[PDB]
């Protein structure tokens, strides 16, 4: 009758597998910059933007011409063994990457006709820039905890080899400006890989981990100055996860956050007064995977062994549009 | 306890508001002709594949440059003056077109940023062929269900200027074989158009048209064949629908199909065995325009005083996937 925020969380839904996939070639910074070093000159830019602004090392990429559907569905083979079931218990798989093989069919679909689902799976992407996978965690919640279905796959591919190489050379083209160069360098940061998630009915995996769900806030009137509003959207976003989750900094163990620059990690852990060390970050070597980097940090915390039963771990996303999103999970 | 079919329909559920734009530009398939005419001779077709294959007279096209999130904001617009309510009350905004602004942000965020929705409003896009608006539907249903909102917008817009352009000039080159040709001339029936649709906790509107939901299958093994194949699992999804909406072809009213060719309609009509004045069509005039189809007709049976409190809507699509979904609206 009254309402409490403990109210709309999820009681009946837990994590039966995760995986993922690192991409295997490696590209260091150096190399790119290497290359990039005439370009440099010309302009006349001795700044390091991606070394020592951006704090990139290097990203991995595809040796092949992988497509977004092929990295998902290794991924999600992957995560079907982690969780020990057949393709033929999926009700639901949803696709959430950036990366896209067509307009159409949806890449769920292509993902589906991989694995063999059944003719009872319902399939469909989701898209909404870095947040996507807790956006297609939280669809599949409320199917499963209705009982509409026992199992879901949330799946995420990203491949970059192709905005590389177009890009790589515009920003060594002679009729390349600043402005236009400073740009196009964004998209350099950015890297492969793949995360799938098998999603469950508790008491069909008892003491499997537990998806509480969360809480979503926007600012899309802004559809130096992204990082100011996104620490802004982020703690509008907080003091409703304060309202729902009833969460503290302090009584949180992990933060599993999109990961994107050395300076844009640092604001928001100042920002937030969180102690770095429950903060794995992987920018640095990985480059930013996109809605893919949540997963795939998440599932790194698990093999590494650093989670245990009752950590409270805290996915958070800050994305484009703006839009910001936090969710728990209890290991 | 024990599980039956209408257990998983939605109780809570209304239609508060509906609108649609119809593109203004005229495109005729004989002004298309006279355009193909001397790559008809080169090629020595003499069958005229749009108007007496496809059975499309013409298709609209927008007049300006004008994006898909343009046209959802102005269906949306509409609807919301249909529903009689302000954008402050809307909790959800769903995008569920094939024509996409950008990689990203998505584009429920640009439409969300026109229209000035709250801090509070969740947005993302759904991406499923000519399915997805229903999926949108369902997604906002479940939330609303839930209690999680009290309203919720899905929006479509659909552009396909750009489309005609490159593919209209690559059917006039010189260099095109007929395997190509063939293949590129399907492009020439999609049509322009936009449709927004409000969504409400029953009790909020009284009367209100009410949305069951439905039920989907696949045969995502597919990602004159698609059109066996598509009936095929239409046939199979009827069962499902049977058996959780308890359907029977002659106690529904309308059937409110997604849009695509004269040959196409009549294959299902005759499978189904449905009298064809119960299915409204536009193809001959607006082509196919994608997911925006089905709500486009719903809107336009509503406006020309076609529907009365207590008819059974079905709704229903088969798209690229392969994937199948019906749903019932009741009046
Ligand atoms: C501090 C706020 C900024 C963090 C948000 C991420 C922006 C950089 C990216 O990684 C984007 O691709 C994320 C996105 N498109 O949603
Ligand atoms: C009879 C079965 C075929 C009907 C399905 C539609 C195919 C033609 C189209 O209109 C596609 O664009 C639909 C789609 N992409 O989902
Ligand atoms: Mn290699
Ligand atoms: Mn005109």
Redesign the pocket.
Known sequence: LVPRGSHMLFQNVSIAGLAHIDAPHTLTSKEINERLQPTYDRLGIKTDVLGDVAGIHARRLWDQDVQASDAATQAARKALIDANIGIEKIGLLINTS?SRDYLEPSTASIVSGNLGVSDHCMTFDVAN???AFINGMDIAARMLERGEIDYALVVDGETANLVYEKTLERMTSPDVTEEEFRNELAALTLGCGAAAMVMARSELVPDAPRYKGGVTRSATEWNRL??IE??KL?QKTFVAAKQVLGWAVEELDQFVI?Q??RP?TA??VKSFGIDPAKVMTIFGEHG?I?PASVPIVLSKLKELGRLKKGDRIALL?????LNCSMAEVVW
């Not at 996303?317 to 549009?321: C, D, F, N, R, V």
Request: hydrophobic content about 50%; some cysteine; glycine content about 22%.
């Open positions: 950036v820039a870095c947040l992204l990082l996104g620490i982020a999109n994107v620059s844009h604001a928001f930013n996109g996303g800050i994305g484009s549009g």
